[PDB]
Design an enzyme around this catalytic site. Structure first.
Site, mmCIF file in Angstrom:
data_model
loop_
_atom_site.group_PDB
_atom_site.id
_atom_site.type_symbol
_atom_site.label_atom_id
_atom_site.label_comp_id
_atom_site.label_asym_id
_atom_site.label_seq_id
_atom_site.Cartn_x
_atom_site.Cartn_y
_atom_site.Cartn_z
ATOM 1 N N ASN A 38 -51.696 76.551 21.879
ATOM 2 C CA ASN A 38 -51.280 77.181 23.139
ATOM 3 C C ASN A 38 -52.471 77.249 24.119
ATOM 4 O O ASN A 38 -53.649 77.258 23.694
ATOM 5 C CB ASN A 38 -50.661 78.570 22.843
ATOM 6 C CG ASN A 38 -49.505 78.495 21.882
ATOM 7 O OD1 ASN A 38 -48.639 77.588 21.995
ATOM 8 N ND2 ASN A 38 -49.488 79.399 20.903
ATOM 9 N N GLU A 68 -38.536 73.069 18.407
ATOM 10 C CA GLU A 68 -39.879 73.621 18.182
ATOM 11 C C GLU A 68 -40.714 72.614 17.416
ATOM 12 O O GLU A 68 -41.886 72.410 17.744
ATOM 13 C CB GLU A 68 -39.805 74.940 17.418
ATOM 14 C CG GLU A 68 -39.308 76.156 18.203
ATOM 15 C CD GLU A 68 -40.173 76.555 19.381
ATOM 16 O OE1 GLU A 68 -41.279 75.997 19.522
ATOM 17 O OE2 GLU A 68 -39.727 77.420 20.165
#
Ligand SMILES: [Cl-]
Ligand SMILES: [Cl-]
Ligand SMILES: [Cl-]
Ligand SMILES: [Cl-]
Ligand SMILES: [Cl-]
Ligand SMILES: [Cl-]
Ligand SMILES: [Cl-]
Ligand SMILES: [Cl-]
Ligand code: NA
Ligand SMILES: [Ru+3]
Length: 129
Positions: free
Chosen positions: A46, A35
């Site tokens: 995002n 991550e």
């Protein structure tokens, strides 16, 4: 802070992640690796306009407030910037809520695609825990 692998393992263990909701410590370390590369300051935008924050890439769509994700929730009741601290308390506390939410660690797509099913114990191998 960029953690070392065993350094982060220890920190996660201290804050009660090892076997939290049945997920062994290597699962958490592996998720952090893919991550954030163990960097507490990591942020990634995002497609939907939300952002993921910190060593576990916690998403503003549901979990923290960043003031720019209309119209998301803040289920961890924390500013997203608290997730970038050198102290992982806020990230661990929030991750505990996330993994309890019904889909377990599949919430972390990099865990599902890169850690799930693999020899995750490799990630704590050699650590003095
Ligand atoms: Cl420690
Ligand atoms: Cl493990
Ligand atoms: Cl705000
Ligand atoms: Cl917002
Ligand atoms: Cl909103
Ligand atoms: Cl806030
Ligand atoms: Cl810490
Ligand atoms: Cl589960
Ligand atoms: Na939010
Ligand atoms: Ru600590």
């Amino acid at each position: 802070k960029v953690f070392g692998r065993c350094e982060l393992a220890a920190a996660m263990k201290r804050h009660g992640l090892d076997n939290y909701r049945g997920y062994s410590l290597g699962n958490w370390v592996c998720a952090a690796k893919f991550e954030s590369n163990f960097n507490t300051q990591a942020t990634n935008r995002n497609t939907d306009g939300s952002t993921d924050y910190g060593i576990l890439q916690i998403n503003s769509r549901w979990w923290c407030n960043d003031g720019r994700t209309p119209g998301s929730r803040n289920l961890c009741n924390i500013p997203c910037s608290a997730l970038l601290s050198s102290d992982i308390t806020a990230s661990v506390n929030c991750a505990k809520k996330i993994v309890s939410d019904g889909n377990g660690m599949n919430a972390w797509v990099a865990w599902r695609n890169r850690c799930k099913g693999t020899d995750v114990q490799a990630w704590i191998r050699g650590c003095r825990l």
